[PDB]
């Protein structure tokens, strides 16, 4: 934003995950869950926050797949939304 | 081939529909 | 296999078979007698109970309805009748 005479003042803009990590997470036998919120902070800054989550395979699990029913997914989604909204 | 002689048949039929008009 | 008494099934198996496919049609549900701890009153309740049942004076909610069975509120005792 401001230049100090060979000093550059930098303010936060954005954040993201490395493509590699993103792909590394996604797999074929699990439900993926996503949500987002638009929140104004206390200083007025307006942020779109994205959230990604996954059904985890249980430790003794025999069944090949871990899938969440739609209502469960909606629930989790709602709670993510709630949480990060409250945080920011 | 079938599709094409069906098509050709519709061409011919349109042409016959032209050559014989209800005016004749 | 090739030998079975369709006449004398073992009671266990008959507990296993679907209610209509039994040698005689036997309802799988029973009338139960519910008692809330804080009161004396006894209440007759159907095993799988739709709606919601109440103890009159205490306004006690006995049970919530669910898909299969009504589920009683905690601490409330019950006895199958006969």
């Amino acid at each position: 934003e401001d230049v100090q005479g060979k000093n550059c003042l930098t303010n936060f803009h954005g954040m993201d995950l490395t493509r590699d990590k993103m792909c590394s997470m996604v797999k074929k036998w699990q439900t993926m869950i996503e949500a987002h919120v638009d929140v104004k902070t206390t200083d007025g800054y307006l942020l779109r926050l994205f959230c990604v989550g996954f059904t985890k395979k249980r430790n003794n699990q025999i069944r090949k797949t871990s899938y969440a029913q739609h209502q469960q997914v909606r629930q989790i989604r709602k709670k993510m939304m709630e949480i990060m909204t409250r945080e920011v | 081939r079938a599709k094409w002689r069906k098509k050709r048949m519709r061409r011919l039929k349109r042409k016959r529909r032209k050559m014989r008009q209800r005016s004749k | 296999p090739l030998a079975k008494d369709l006449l004398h099934p073992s009671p266990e198996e008959e507990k296993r078979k679907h209610k209509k496919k039994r040698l005689v049609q036997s309802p799988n549900s029973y009338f139960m007698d519910v008692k809330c701890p804080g009161c004396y009153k006894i209440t007759t309740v159907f095993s799988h109970a739709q709606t919601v049942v109440l103890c009159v004076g205490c306004s006690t909610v006995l049970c919530q309805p669910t898909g299969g069975k009504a589920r009683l509120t905690e601490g409330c005792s019950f006895r199958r009748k006969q």
Partner: protein, 101 residues
Amino acid sequence: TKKRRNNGRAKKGRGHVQPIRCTNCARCVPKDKAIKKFVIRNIVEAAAVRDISEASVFDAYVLPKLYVKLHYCVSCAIHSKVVRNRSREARKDRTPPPRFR
């Protein structure tokens, strides 16, 4: 004469599936039929690993991996030899090939 019991596609109990674009071809094929091959490899390949490993500013820097989902129309696969035809009885076996030693 019916060739496959499943008709080459995974479609059961549903009427129509979303069509997808071939990786190699651009030839339209339904997702069920499409031969899918997932590819997990390293961005830089075999020798340039040991090569670049030395030119790093970081210590114990692990090379990123490239992940690519591939769809091939039935033709292209048999061309690239990703899939090859087999005997009448041996066809019946849907157990994937032993890349696991």
